[PDB]
Design a protein around this ligand. Structure first.
Ligand SMILES: [Ca+2]
Ligand SMILES: [Ca+2]
Ligand SMILES: [Ca+2]
Ligand SMILES: [Ca+2]
Ligand SMILES: [Ca+2]
Ligand SMILES: [Ca+2]
Ligand SMILES: [Ca+2]
Ligand SMILES: [Ca+2]
Ligand SMILES: [Ca+2]
Ligand SMILES: [Ca+2]
Lengths: 211, 222, 222, 211
């Protein structure tokens, strides 16, 4: 359930599900952002520190790559699972693939070479279709949603941090993100330089006090 | 037919179907093998006909390591998959059938994409992608060196750009009955194959350049 | 100078040297940031001048993740190393000197190659290879977000193909004195830089589009 | 010091330094060649079997790649060592590199960018020179020699096997190879289908007897 601590903070802060952390001091805010990008060099999970690779750090939302080969692999596997949950439709795809197979098989036999082959699987069909996340038309909200949905897939990630993203989002959008995150039950941090609407959030004051 | 010439030969030698050329002198044998591997920078080594026209270096297929020869290399697979696509292109009715089936599959996967919580897009499933997904490749059930040779000859017949296959020093791996079977198989596929040997290959019909550099026509009809 | 226009503006806005543009409405701010990232497919978003001529998409340099910005990317390094080679090409005396030294080194390594028991060959040591071997790269001693910004502006000045740099939502990382220092540094390098902000950046001279979409000239001379 | 055993062989045969193994039966010869290429699937060093990666197997001599990145690395390192053994000449190279460095340094300072750099090392000079084994003009003997010389570098290889190479080599050439191998003290096997001149060699007869 991951907790955060630094010199300014007297007691470690619990980051469960969706958390907004607002730091009103510019120099402390900029410093913490810097330290996130440098994690870990300077200074629940039973006292266990998170590996650098467990961190998912986002400032440039639109530029963030949600279509990496590891992510595509998980999406295609998830889609294969959807077919597995529908035996009716899975059989349809298989029947279609078997017809295709025999058409290619006939051409293989006509070819002068002694040719062999394996099979066309549902997963191979999904991959060949080039299924990917649409990002071209993304609003910043839409891309934030896609990033969180990807974080849901990544088991080796246990903290997603949006740096200074609040400025792009309406109150209703922040709520919608948070509600999805709460349902997901993985830790997300919105690290903000000023109050994000009137939403529940941890505020470190200009006098370094926690609210 | 392909013709071979080099200084030691008095005249060019015709290489039609399966030919065995035996060189009994180690130095001359070794030099000829070297010149084949250098073709055509050497010459000395001449390969022609194409009526009087030299074979391009690209037309030569040299095999010394029989088991190491990769019948399903990336370039060979690319050729096979492209040729199979062309076979569909030449058959409009069946091409249309494959395309129809791929589109029905696409519509089914598209539905699952919309059901999925992510905003998903995709391209298309092509005939080439289907051929590739099926894992089409040349059958390779050969265990022995003898068996492997047939697969190599099959590749040679497939490659229209090749006009001479040379097995270098392969006789040592093969029984007499095996060489006969290979030569019979070679005869069926029409293209020139040379077995280049350092010693006489049993008592089979063969050209022999002996220790005094005479060309002898061994078990050959007078 | 570069000019920016979009429907909410009554007339184009001149972006000369350092400019702060503040948009107090979340939706309009978010939409403008999106349109910058989509430039030029959107438009709506207009960027021109080049006297009346639209900036090409390639002329825009957008920075939101300051610390993530890679100042020594492979493309940037390739440009730097090529430019340094060109600097030698423009100086025949020094080019000749480098070539002479490389040839003396070559003759020394060549001797060791002949002493070595392997039959060794080689090509040549080029000026470009020497530049690359030396590990020439932009100095990056920045620790803070503020310090990193100077390195980004330096890259922007270097890239002649870029004609607008936009820092998106960067004001939140910087003190007032820091923004002033950045703007003073930007002024020295002549090219247009836009700080695109969702809230007023201290009391610095800035253009503000307020909640009712009025354009206000904040701490600006009347 | 590696030993060889198979069904036909009643006792394991010691393969020390250069060894010629002649098998007069065509079917046994072809079979053993096949098994070498399949090692290990079918059936000194204290009873320890060699890994497949310890094997260096050569039939197509001229086609064999002696200029792989791992080999080039070792050659360039060996050449750097030759300079290290000659402090006089090493200093000459360094002095020349330092002059080059300052010429580039001046251009770096003239350039509008604030540029830094490291150093030009002897090893980097050798690599930039593109030092490699010449193979284009190779006779088969010359390439055999190069292959053995490369085997000398490869510490993770402990048996080099030339399959049916004798046919290409004169007696004096086989001697020259063997003498280098004996000096090297790594195991090399010449696997031959008939006697290789009158040189000392292990012969398995047409009646399967060892001489
Ligand atoms: Ca067939
Ligand atoms: Ca398959
Ligand atoms: Ca596709
Ligand atoms: Ca989208
Ligand atoms: Ca969907
Ligand atoms: Ca040498
Ligand atoms: Ca400089
Ligand atoms: Ca260096
Ligand atoms: Ca070079
Ligand atoms: Ca050589």
């Amino acid at each position: 359930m991951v907790k955060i601590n630094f010199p300014i903070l007297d007691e470690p802060l619990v980051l469960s599900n969706a958390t907004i952390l607002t730091i009103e001091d510019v120099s402390v805010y900029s410093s913490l952002v810097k330290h996130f990008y440098q994690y870990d060099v300077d200074e629940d999970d039973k006292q266990k520190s998170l590996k650098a690779t467990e961190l998912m750090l986002v400032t440039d939302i639109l530029g963030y790559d949600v279509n990496s080969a590891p992510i595509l692999k998980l999406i295609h596997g998830d889609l294969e699972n959807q077919f597995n949950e529908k035996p009716e439709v899975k059989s349809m795809v298989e029947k279609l693939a078997a017809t295709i197979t025999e058409l290619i098989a006939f051409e293989c036999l006509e070819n002068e070479l002694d040719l062999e082959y394996d099979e066309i699987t549902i997963l191979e069909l999904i991959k060949a279709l080039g299924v990917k996340i649409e990002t071209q038309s993304d609003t910043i909200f839409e891309k934030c949603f896609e990033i969180i949905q990807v974080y849901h897939y990544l088991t080796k990630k246990n903290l997603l941090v949006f740096v200074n993203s609040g400025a792009y989002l309406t109150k209703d959008e922040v709520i919608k993100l948070c509600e999805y995150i709460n349902l997901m039950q993985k830790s997300v941090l919105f690290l903000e330089p000023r109050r994000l609407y009137d939403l529940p959030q941890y505020v470190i004051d200009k006098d370094y006090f926690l609210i």
